[PDB]
Design a binder for this molecule. Sequence first.
Ligand code: CLA
Ligand code: CLA
Ligand code: CLA
Ligand code: CLA
Ligand code: CLA
Ligand code: CLA
Ligand code: CLA
Ligand SMILES: CCCCCCCCCCCCCCCC(=O)OC[C@H](COP(=O)(O)OC[C@@H](O)CO)OC(=O)CCCCCCCCCCCCCCC
Ligand SMILES: CC1=C(/C=C/C(C)=C/C=C/C(C)=C\C=C\C=C(C)\C=C\C=C(C)\C=C\C2=C[C@@H](C)[C@H](O)CC2(C)C)C(C)(C)C[C@@H](O)C1
Ligand SMILES: CC1=C(/C=C/C(C)=C/C=C/C(C)=C/C=C/C=C(C)/C=C/C=C(C)/C=C/C2=C(C)CCCC2(C)C)C(C)(C)CCC1
Ligand SMILES: CC1=C(C/C=C(\C)CCC[C@H](C)CCC[C@H](C)CCCC(C)C)C(=O)c2ccccc2C1=O
Ligand code: SF4
Ligand code: SF4
Ligand SMILES: [Cl-]
Lengths: 69, 751, 73, 80, 40, 143, 141, 73
Amino acid sequence: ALNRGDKVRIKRTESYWYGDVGTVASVEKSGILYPVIVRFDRVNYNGFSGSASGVNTNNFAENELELVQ
Amino acid sequence: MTISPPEREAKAKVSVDNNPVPTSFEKWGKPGHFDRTLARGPKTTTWIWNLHANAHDFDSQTSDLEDVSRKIFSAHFGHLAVVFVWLSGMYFHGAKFSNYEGWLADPTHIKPSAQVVWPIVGQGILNGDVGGGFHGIQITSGLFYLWRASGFTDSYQLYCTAIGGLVMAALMLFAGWFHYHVKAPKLEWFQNVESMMNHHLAGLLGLGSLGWAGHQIHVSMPINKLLDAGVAPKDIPLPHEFILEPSKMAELYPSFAQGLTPFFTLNWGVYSDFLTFKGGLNPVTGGLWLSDTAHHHLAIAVLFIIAGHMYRTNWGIGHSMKEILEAHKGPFTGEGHKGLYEILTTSWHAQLAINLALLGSLTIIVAQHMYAMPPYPYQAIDYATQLSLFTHHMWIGGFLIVGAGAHGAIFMVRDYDPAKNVNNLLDRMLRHRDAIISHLNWVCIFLGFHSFGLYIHNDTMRALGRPQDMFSDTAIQLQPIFAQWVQHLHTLAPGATAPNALATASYAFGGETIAVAGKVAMMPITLGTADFMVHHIHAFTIHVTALILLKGVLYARSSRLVPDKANLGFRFPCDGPGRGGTCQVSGWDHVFLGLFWMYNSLSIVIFHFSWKMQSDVWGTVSPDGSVTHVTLGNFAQSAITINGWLRDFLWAQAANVINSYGSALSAYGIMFLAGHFVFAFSLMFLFSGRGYWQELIESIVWAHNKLNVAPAIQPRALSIIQGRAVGVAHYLLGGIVTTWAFFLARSLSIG
Amino acid sequence: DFLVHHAIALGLHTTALILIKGALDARGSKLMPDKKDFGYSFPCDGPGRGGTCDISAWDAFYLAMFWMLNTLG
Amino acid sequence: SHSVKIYDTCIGCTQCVRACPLDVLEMVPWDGCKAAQIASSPRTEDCVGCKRCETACPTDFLSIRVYLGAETTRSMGLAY
Amino acid sequence: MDGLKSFLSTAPVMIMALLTFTAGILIEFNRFYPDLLFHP
Amino acid sequence: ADDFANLTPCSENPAYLAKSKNFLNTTNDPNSGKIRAERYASALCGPEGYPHLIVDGRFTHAGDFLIPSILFLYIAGWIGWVGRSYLIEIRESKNPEMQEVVINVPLAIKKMLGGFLWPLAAVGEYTSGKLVMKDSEIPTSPR
Amino acid sequence: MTELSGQPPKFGGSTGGLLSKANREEKYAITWTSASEQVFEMPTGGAAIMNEGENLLYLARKEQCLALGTQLRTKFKPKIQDYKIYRVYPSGEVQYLHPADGVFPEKVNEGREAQGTKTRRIGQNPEPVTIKFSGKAPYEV
Amino acid sequence: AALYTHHQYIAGFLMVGAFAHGAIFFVRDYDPVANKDNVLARMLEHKEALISHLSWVSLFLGFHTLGLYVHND
Ligand code: CLA
Ligand code: CLA
Ligand code: CLA
Ligand code: CLA
Ligand code: CLA
Ligand code: CLA
Ligand code: CLA
Ligand SMILES: CCCCCCCCCCCCCCCC(=O)OC[C@H](COP(=O)(O)OC[C@@H](O)CO)OC(=O)CCCCCCCCCCCCCCC
Ligand SMILES: CC1=C(/C=C/C(C)=C/C=C/C(C)=C\C=C\C=C(C)\C=C\C=C(C)\C=C\C2=C[C@@H](C)[C@H](O)CC2(C)C)C(C)(C)C[C@@H](O)C1
Ligand SMILES: CC1=C(/C=C/C(C)=C/C=C/C(C)=C/C=C/C=C(C)/C=C/C=C(C)/C=C/C2=C(C)CCCC2(C)C)C(C)(C)CCC1
Ligand SMILES: CC1=C(C/C=C(\C)CCC[C@H](C)CCC[C@H](C)CCCC(C)C)C(=O)c2ccccc2C1=O
Ligand code: SF4
Ligand code: SF4
Ligand SMILES: [Cl-]
């Protein structure tokens, strides 16, 4: 149901971006658990100590994204 | 393309690239440009810190050894320009905001000052009355004493010197820009270590002391000869008059009547009236005889110029250092110094480790030699200058030594090539690091037990009403008999093993009590049980600092715990909570711990200096001849217990610092409390960890998102390494500022 | 008495802050969303995700003990 | 010995195994992700718990989790 | 050039300029009207 | 009536008078101490002779806290509001982090110069829904 | 596991190698072939020389062997990827360890059975109160 | 003096322990479905606000008390 460019809010709870908003980059094919790829303006904590920034993309399932746009 | 001079090489090994880096301002507005992991810009606040953390890490910016060398050379020029700005600032404040001429006219009834404070919000009280109607801050840097020994008599000469210093700073800055951007020398040029050593020996150190011997003979010596004779500074001719009118020199020094002929005919003895070997001190000023220092600089110059001829360059004569090194190998040490020439000619960090170690050791030697052989007129009587200079040079030396540890570790991680170190000294050091470190560990345990433990024994015995069971000069004695024997040897030397010397090299070893005005400048510094105990404290703390930093270097590549530590780098926080926990295994963390231990060592050294000089050396002398010391000889009985140091040293002498309110010393009480606060503040960073703070920041970021005020550059807690760096920086700053305020209030309030 | 009472207020509020924030984040934060799976006390969670020293609620107790002593002082 | 678990958010990027300095983990066939692979931990008896794997993980909160457990000579990283 | 203006508008230069200006403000105010513990 | 009996006017307090005849000169003005004595002789002093500030809210001592409080609050709200406004304005500029690190001097000065109306601006943003955000739209951690 | 072969690296000795654990408890072996006699870094400190042909080296831990292996396959111009790591007991038993199935673990290989896999998310672990007074932890159930 | 100091130190230890065990409760015993929407869970639900306002009042008190003290100094 999601498409590239959709603004979605994260609902995974344990995810760094729960309550934050990202944009859909691609949707993977069926048979996969987490097909929806989302990009974020705010990087997460990912990285060894002292690394400049973090990871800004993650895979989710449709039940974990809430369409905002 | 900028300015294009001709060429400037004269069959020289000079080789440069013309205009490799054009002059431009764009990257000034692109912060972090030098780091690829930074150039795109920030996303979190960590980006800011690393920008400062890696600014001078030229290795991590480029893998080209030549470009690193060029950056280093121009940075050195910039640093010299900074030092020139600072020194010319000192001379300018001496010219325009000091009482230098007034002090010069009567240096026994006026306190040197060279900083006037503007009257605002009450701080004008810091302009204490230093004598002669002058009001300002009393300086302890010894600038006045240096300027008097050099022969300054006027504000205008100091002003001309400040202007020359500014011009020199401009010249250094232009040279740095020129050799990075216009004519950058090649890597082949920097690696000319033989020629560089010839020039730094014969040219930088040799000609330096030669020119200074010239100035001392022609300017310092006659002018000070007249100053100490009671001649008013205005009645003394200007420095150039002794060179225009050689009869002035000849009547101050009859040998000048014979001129330069005795010099070229090896008839040097004729010069015995101004090239002297008196020893001792000047009776009028309490400082070393300037004639002695001129003869000293002449001999040092001859020595260094001769030394500047050992190494081969363009003429076949001389030595290859590679050959010498390779020839020194023995049955105990494999291939010996093979590979050292390649290390020290391709690794900047190896050279910097050597040079930091030696330069710090030298700065310490400078403190130790200048206190007991006071080189400047009226410095020994100024106990504040004496204490301040000793402690300042101590701290500088300690920091340089710890840096030497840091850069030995960086060499091990970044430049050590195992294929270039097969069975040489470095390799064998690595191959028995365990023996080395386990033994250093045990020596530190033994030295701590049998130094500090002696103090604990004494404290416990004295508290138990058992003075006869203590280690003291009046009970169980620990006499430092070897130091006493060498002191006796020095005292006998002027008459036996130093015939052509009239006095001792230093009265601390023994002999007369040199006093200028009513205060002692120097007198025999006797050594007993308390001195034994504190010397072993010094050996202990130095050994522990060495243990930490040497372990840091020798295990930077690997350990039984972490066999791939090299891949982790020189600076990194740990390798996780596994293996039981691996925090602080890096060489950087060994430097971080060695900083605290160096601070410990030097704090004890300088406390020892202050208390021993106040108790047994410094003081006022009656016209009857007897001496009465600042703290009434309390060292021997009080310095043998921790309670004695807590009560008779710290508690007693802190009375000046804490009562400084309402006087010109008030700022010292302010900064005493300031150092205390910074010390306490450092404990937050040292006793905690970044996870807690990152979660607290999460809550605060929620607060900001609530009002739509959260920054794009996301706040992150400091990194583990940075938490440690901030903690140790604040620990050292606070503790050192505390001791500084304490020392200055004390030594300024004790006559 | 006024100034020292505000010092006491600062000390009480700061110790409460450390303790309450440790308790509320004991089950999880954005740095450790699964912290309840690791227990009340544990060394850390390693140098990853920026570094995670003193991340547990036990660590919050340990940090607040210093402020307790300071307030009592 | 420490425990190492691999949850179904794994994208199979193999950085788990590439980071392990003690060969605890493996890439085994799977179907949950595009890469048709998942990380496995058949040799946790050699795990020391350095946490390099999780430091390497890209997924939003890790797909590999190391929970330190009963300490042995191997897990304490002892060469003696 | 644009590089020099961008460098002059960086956070450290800008914050030190603001701090110097505010320091001058407060210093001169307390020079011409010192010792204001409260409002008369 | 007999309120604040533990204190006396500084002009009444003799210890204050003795110490105020010796008030130092804080600047170059040789009358700074005398002006200070005259000025502080209006507050309420204690047995030691120093002024004591009454901040319980009475307007007879409004100059002891209320007026500086109002002044500070105006200035601090100004600073925070113009900073937040610039921070908002950067967000629409593709790369906001750069303008957070390399300040847009013209834009930032435009924002600073318009801060004297920050109370009305904040009231308008409150009513319009611009100031505060909703809970369900703000990232939070697991509970 | 039959009998380990290969020359020991040319090395003058060090204090950083095997201790009592090697004979009382366990030690580790790594073999590898080199196309040339060449210098490498010992994980226990210093430089050693590997022989042309087969090489056999004993170390105290598995981690030191894997560190040497990464050095072999990532720090030599033609790589050395044929290294094998074994565990050795005082009884003489030799336990082949690495690469476990003849294929490096970083790349998928058929025949491997998933271990420690969970069919859930980390966030889908059960509440600890639901499993208290049992022996398990939320990641063990 | 000794009694007052003694009892206040004991009380400080007790308070720190009470908060430590509140944290341990959240780690070990808290059932979110049984306390669903009650006062406990609701405290957990705005923990960001609680921690943030505690931080704010801490900063308030610290800045201003240290400021008054240092001004007086
Ligand atoms: C106005 C003259 C000028 C111009 C425009 C440039 C231009 C440039 N230089 Mg150059 N350079 C100059 C003078 C100049 N330089 C001087 C005088 C020196 C001798 C120190 C050098 C030595 C030098 C080196 C070694 C390097 C450059 C580099 C660069 C490039 C990056 C600069 C940067 O990172 O941002 C600007 C950064 C700053 C302005 C630093 C801030 C000032 C510091 C923090 C303190 C001031 C120290 C100062 C140099 C001396 C003190 C002055 C004294 C009065 C107290 C850039 C194109 C770097 C490069 O090539 O990048 C790859 C490089 O590594 N320069
Ligand atoms: C007699 C020749 C000579 C002299 C005097 C020096 C002196 C110096 N060198 Mg250099 N060097 C030389 C030859 C010489 N070098 C040669 C032949 C090479 C090629 C192998 C090098 C390559 C070299 C490198 C790579 C570096 C130095 C550096 C330095 C400086 C660091 C030490 C210092 O700060 O001391 C004290 C400082 C002073 C006394 C300040 C004075 C400096 C001025 C410019 C010297 C003017 C003297 C000049 C001969 C005029 C005297 C004539 C008349 C006035 C009496 C220093 C000023 C380091 C440096 O700092 O780079 C800038 C550096 O990294 N040297
Ligand atoms: C860099 C330091 C320095 C500087 C620049 C000066 C500068 C000066 N000195 Mg001085 N001096 C110095 C160091 C220095 N000196 C030291 C270290 C000493 C201690 C030995 C002295 C002791 C000294 C004395 C006693 C005198 C001076 C004098 C002078 C002035 C005239 C000398 C001259 O240059 O004429 C030029 C020199 C010559 C033309 C020399 C030629 C004469 C002989 C015969 C040539 C032999 C050279 C030959 C190669 C050697 C072979 C000899 C052998 C075959 C027999 C001059 C301004 C004179 C003066 O004016 O007093 C105020 C003087 O009387 N100086
Ligand atoms: C000639 C001496 C010398 C030289 C040139 C170098 C060169 C270098 N060092 Mg080394 N080092 C030295 C001495 C020296 N060091 C000393 C004396 C010590 C002991 C403290 C060390 C310990 C050391 C460590 C631990 C590290 C280095 C690192 C580095 C590299 C990065 C420089 C940097 O950090 O950038 C930028 C510099 C800063 C951000 C400094 C700012 C913080 C300072 C300490 C604040 C000082 C406060 C001030 C003095 C007083 C308070 C004022 C305040 C109230 C306003 C660089 C190549 C780093 C590296 O990774 O090497 C590759 C690193 O890890 N050095
Ligand atoms: C006063 C505080 C203190 C004390 C007591 C110590 C103690 C010690 N440190 Mg340490 N250190 C401290 C602060 C302190 N540290 C801090 C704040 C830091 C942070 C930077 C460090 C970081 C540090 C490092 C990195 C290292 C040390 C090292 C050492 C040991 C040096 C060897 C030695 O002295 O042997 C002898 C022990 C003593 C003198 C301690 C006193 C013993 C008393 C006098 C006698 C005991 C009486 C008896 C046993 C009582 C028994 C009672 C009965 C009921 C059982 C030593 C045990 C070095 C080391 O381990 O060297 C091998 C080491 O590398 N320290
Ligand atoms: C952090 C708390 C704090 C607070 C409450 C104060 C408060 C005060 N301090 Mg102190 N101080 C502090 C910390 C603090 N200080 C610290 C940490 C130190 C150590 C460095 C000092 C050291 C210190 C000294 C040495 C002195 C003071 C002085 C003063 C008093 C001067 C007030 C003044 O300048 O008049 C009012 C000033 C202004 C109105 C100018 C402010 C600039 C404004 C914004 C100009 C712009 C006008 C703008 C348009 C607004 C106009 C109204 C508008 C609505 C139309 C004041 C009561 C001075 C004093 O006289 O003590 C009684 C004094 O000499 N302080
Ligand atoms: C004198 C020591 C000291 C100081 C000053 C602090 C400071 C602080 N701690 Mg800390 N702490 C300490 C020791 C100290 N700690 C120790 C030993 C531990 C045990 C490890 C802890 C553990 C700890 C924890 C766990 C927490 C704190 C918290 C806090 C903050 C409380 C709020 C506050 O007071 O607001 C005001 C701030 C201050 C009074 C300190 C700043 C003072 C400076 C002078 C302000 C002026 C800025 C200055 C001019 C900057 C320019 C510098 C320039 C010269 C280079 C505060 C910043 C709590 C917190 O973060 O609250 C939100 C918190 O959670 N502390
Ligand atoms: C107060 C001093 C008086 C008390 C005496 C204390 C005796 C201390 C032991 C004597 C020194 C032994 C080192 C020289 C002995 C010496 O160098 O022999 C020579 C031998 C190497 O000789 P080679 O023939 O290999 O020389 C070839 C060279 O060119 C190098 O390649 O050195 C070694 O074998 C390395 C072993 C050093 C390990 C010993 C060091 C132990 C540390 C403690 C030393 C304390 C000294 C404190 C004095 C400041
Ligand atoms: C507008 C603004 C913002 C935000 C503003 C917000 C959202 C503010 C929110 C405030 C809230 C939610 C609550 C505030 C409560 C305030 C209280 C309870 C004040 C109590 C004060 C009392 C009781 C004072 C009493 C005394 C009265 C004077 C009554 C006496 O003599 C002294 C004394 C101390 C007794 C930013 C942060 C976005 C930007 C800033 O620039 C300003
Ligand atoms: C004044 C007065 C009065 C009043 C009083 C009052 C009203 C009060 C009360 C008070 C109070 C009211 C107090 C309190 C305090 C509190 C506290 C101190 C707390 C706590 C808690 C803790 C510590 C813990 C917690 C937890 C957690 C953390 C989690 C889980 C759960 C729990 C619970 C465990 C009267 C009139 C009567 C009389 C007169 C006087
Ligand atoms: C308090 C603390 C923090 C929080 C500290 C932070 C986030 C730093 C805050 C610094 C502010 C943002 C800058 C203030 C200091 C400036 C550098 C001074 C500049 C002054 C000029 C404007 C004149 C950690 O991140 C941390 C990490 C690891 C171990 C211990 C600790 C730790 O104790
Ligand atoms: S506590 Fe910090 S430094 Fe130590 S292992 Fe854990 S993360 Fe690393
Ligand atoms: S553990 Fe994580 S990072 Fe490693 S391969 Fe599996 S999904 Fe990728
Ligand atoms: Cl005693």
